[PDB]
Design a protein around this ligand. Structure first.
Ligand SMILES: CC1=NC(NN/C=C/Cc2ccccc2[N+](=O)[O-])=NC(=O)C1
Lengths: 210, 213
């Protein structure tokens, strides 16, 4: 979990606006005008687009604006263009990072994920494995976050999630798996997979059977 | 205003690699606010060095930073698979005066071939009540990151409704993928079994599941 809190994702068609938030404490965001925003194209070096909450370096157009209210800073991108499709990170100066927001300029219609939660198979149990798998298919944009629950409360370790890939129907698919031991699986009431895409969250629950 | 890094560098497990960040006398040369960041593809960046040489809490002493004139260096000793990532330098001069290097892709050489774990899941109770019978074949812990998948209905090849994700690198430094077959309840219930066959480096592994009793 990132020292600063940014929504995972955001999207618009060309010419639309997107606003993205970055929340900290009075110790960082809420005490000093030292919030920066970075634009990073997958594979490339980051570009500084805002510093000290609101300042644009030279070459950064006025489409990009930065504001701060109490313990939360926002970056607004107006008139979205192709080239604005990237990862956006905030920071606060020691130095604290947000977890990043994937900003998509819609290349096709939005599609909500199909989510299927599989309990452990017979065969893997007899190998002392209780890996759960949350299959997430047929979504756009190709940005998703997965949380896992044990009973009525969050779980931490175990969780792996694949990088979403574009399938034959031109929508994205990914897999989140929780590598449980049979003892962990058999000793809880239920486990749950929570899939967040385009600000809506889907929950699936499974429990052990006989 | 950019800093200059070599685009690529490599080393063997247990060995060192040194990577440079060349600035001017007014960025790197003009102050000791040189940072280094580690970034795994798809992930947020992590600060590993600030003020030329200082490690944040939780960064091992395998990572060391120095500076000589307008060039700053990062050394990673005891190279491990987790160290395979992009490394960026920055220099900070107070205003808009934050400058970045273009990044160095650090490869850890000689990661050993690893065969996949293959786990095949029959349809969940919940999707069957929702008139769906998708199967998933989880393929994890393999290296290198190329697999081919084939499905069978009973003994017969399946040629339609198969999708396999592009293998991605997970936190154990090995590749995972999923192959899913989107059957109807009627297709699932009318066959004796479905099988997923995973081929990796010319070796083949097959799993079979059957409608439950
Ligand atoms: C001294 C100060 N240092 C910094 N460093 N910011 C570093 C940011 C680095 C970053 C951001 C987004 C994506 C990738 C990366 N990366 O370097 O890998 N920001 C400040 O305001 C002040």
């Amino acid at each position: 979990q990132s020292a600063l809190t940014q929504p995972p994702s955001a999207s618009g068609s060309p010419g639309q606006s997107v606003t993205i938030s970055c929340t900290g404490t009075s110790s960082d965001v809420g005490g000093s005008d030292s919030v920066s925003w970075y634009q990073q194209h997958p594979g490339k070096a980051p570009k500084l687009i805002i510093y000290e909450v609101s300042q644009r370096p030279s070459g950064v157009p006025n489409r990009f604006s930065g504001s701060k209210s109490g313990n939360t800073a926002s970056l607004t991108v107006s008139g979205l263009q192709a080239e604005d499709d990237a990862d956006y990170y905030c920071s606060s100066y020691n130095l604290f990072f947000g977890g990043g927001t994937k900003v998509t300029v819609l290349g096709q219609p939005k599609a909500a994920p199909s989510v299927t939660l599989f309990p452990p198979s017979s065969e893997e149990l007899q190998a002392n494995k209780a890996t759960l798998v949350c299959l997430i298919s047929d979504f756009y944009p190709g940005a998703v976050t997965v949380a896992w629950k044990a009973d009525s409360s969050p779980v931490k370790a175990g969780v792996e999630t694949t990088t979403p890939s574009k399938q034959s129907n031109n929508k994205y698919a990914a897999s989140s798996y929780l590598s449980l031991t049979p003892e962990q699986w058999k000793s809880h009431r239920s486990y749950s997979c929570q899939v967040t895409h385009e600000g809506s969250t889907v929950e699936k629950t499974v429990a052990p059977t006989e």
